[PDB]
Design a protein around this nucleic acid. Structure first.
Ligand SMILES: [Zn+2]
Ligand SMILES: [Zn+2]
Ligand SMILES: [Zn+2]
Ligand SMILES: [Zn+2]
Lengths: 194, 194, 194, 194
DNA sequence: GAGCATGCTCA
DNA sequence: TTGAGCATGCTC
DNA sequence: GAGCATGCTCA
DNA sequence: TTGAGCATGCTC
């Protein structure tokens, strides 16, 4: 979760460099290791490895509340959006994180913790690339009443083999909001105190 | 829609300068009540003559703008599912009457609009009006509900058979800070009055 | 159509006076007898009569292209909007004009000319009012490709008795567009040449 | 997605300064073709070695932005129903090949994407490239279709079995005035180049 | 709402 | 047949 | 994007 | 319990 290890494959995440039109809907903050994005907008997250993972490897994405006081609560879409008609025909209505660009994502709910997660097969970079890109979408604002309700979350991306064993793990905070650029500057300026 | 009828029926609101004003404050220039969610709002019933025996008072909410007037005013998805019920009011109803052991919560079979009805009671000896306490269970801003759309509360005096005897109305804004918001709307309004 | 007669009841239309927030979505131009409005926005049209119409009277609204070269073509929604999911559960998908605020409008298609029209019962003004208001909605922009395709239209409002006989008739041009205020000024300034 | 393969495959476009430029003009700095609706666009196929016998060339359109990349690119509701068919191309297809009596119009059974395939033909004696003429049947602005969303045309060289031999691509903007629009996008682009 | 984005009209 | 200028929805 | 619109945090 | 100021989606 909060702990990130590269494992035997040197796994870790990367984010889009600044200076692109995508920045308006999705912008990453290095000093805060936090992604600021708008609701239902595709966010390109990069997967970096120093060695090819075993055949059949998978990449899972899960959201957990950052504050230890809310860590046990399952992150889910608020009552309103869970009922909106925005389903892609693949993602369940209550899931916050969706993968865009994949015909066969696996949307899971842990039988014990009841946490939602989405899994897609691991794919190596395109020829001439040092990373693989997976586009994610967050279907609720961090402010949504009855949902995240202004509570910040962390997205945990874990590399696992075909059997479900962890091969690597990385994470980043996320704020789904109306104005990513504005809100990112705010938190960064506020951060400039130490 | 505002007629006093044969009984001089019209509404009244408590004058300013009371601790209650913080949670509920009426604006004469805008004929608009500003109140907090779930807080009791005292509305006064005034008549020039005693209504026929068995008369009733109905409260109903409708969106003020013709653009949304046909949409039934109801609580948003989140609050409907909160456990704030009083054991009398249906979960979807926005307006609840406080202090009455026997209110009637109705849904019109044709328009599907919600309304609450209580018996008409004469003023207490020494008073010139009757007070009914209402509570609004969603903010005007609630996503998936009123969603920032202003509403009007329509109070009608009816005989035992359901015939209208009189009708009055006022705009309502349920919000976190009634005082602040009332001033804001009044100042804007006054920005044309001088 | 183009000819307007008040009949034995002095029937004629009236429009909302300027200086209201509604003006942004719906604004009438007197010198051009033209209504500029946005798509799917409620337009309050006033019905004026000097005498009470016979019991069972009806008010019909129909759209016809203004140019004699297109007069024979039936005005309908373009291919795209006819398939959008904006139906109110009462109006057929191809109809341009819809009535808002009525539970029982009659949406018709002339068996011979195939022209669409919507009919609602005539209702007298509210007490203290000199006119009756009917809210209409136009479901396509005048510019819609494959629909009105930049061709201006006329809305014909006719008062008819219970049997379908004409009692009165009035009309006005309409431009459904993105910016009513902007476009109204444009045509008015252009009109200022004579 | 751009690799020349073992046959040095890549695309070429006619140089500027031809009457054709008015209906079809390529922009080197933006690797973007600007063309009018239904106008033939000559695309050049270049290879350094003769492809295996039975090779084919496929053309497919995809939305450039990851936000819309999964949505199948197709003609809008209006043009699909226009009677501009050539008796070969399905009504919903955006890209049509001109000058070939036997093109194959396909729809992938899984992604449902449209594509058109024609046999690979060697350059005419004396030429260093092969020309294929394509037509785009909707403007990039068509409502209910591309709806102002930029697209990419992907041309792939494949052997007789369907295996990719090479692949290249270019952005496309179908519009009313290619020259004007090309300059506009280039000037903006140049507003960072100096 | 402004300004940008874009098909259509006019000579 | 071709822009130039007018006409018009969309971005923020 | 700016500025307005509004619930929540803090003392 | 109450604003003041901060936090944030929506209007145009
Ligand atoms: Zn939500
Ligand atoms: Zn609510
Ligand atoms: Zn249309
Ligand atoms: Zn089209």
């Amino acid at each position: 979760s909060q702990k990130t290890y590269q494992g035997n494959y040197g796994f870790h995440l990367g984010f889009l460099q600044s200076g692109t039109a995508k920045s308006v809907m999705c912008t990453y903050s290095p000093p805060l290791n936090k992604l600021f994005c708008q609701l239902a907008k595709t966010c390109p997250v990069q997967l970096w490895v120093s060695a090819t993972p075993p055949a059949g490897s998978r990449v899972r994405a899960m959201a957990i509340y950052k504050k230890s006081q809310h860590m046990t609560e399952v992150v889910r879409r608020c009552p309103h959006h869970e009922r909106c008609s925005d389903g892609d025909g693949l993602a369940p209505p209550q899931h916050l994180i969706r993968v865009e660009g994949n015909l066969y994502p696996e949307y899971l709910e842990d039988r014990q913790t009841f946490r939602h997660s989405v899994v897609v097969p691991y794919e190596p970079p395109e020829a001439g690339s040092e990373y693989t890109t997976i586009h994610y979408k967050y279907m609720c604002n961090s402010s949504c009443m009855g949902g995240m309700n202004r509570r910040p979350i962390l997205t945990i991306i874990t590399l696992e083999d075909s059997s479900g064993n962890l091969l690597g793990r990385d994470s980043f905070e996320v704020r789904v909001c109306a104005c990513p650029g504005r809100d990112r500057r705010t938190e960064e300026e506020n951060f400039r105190k130490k």
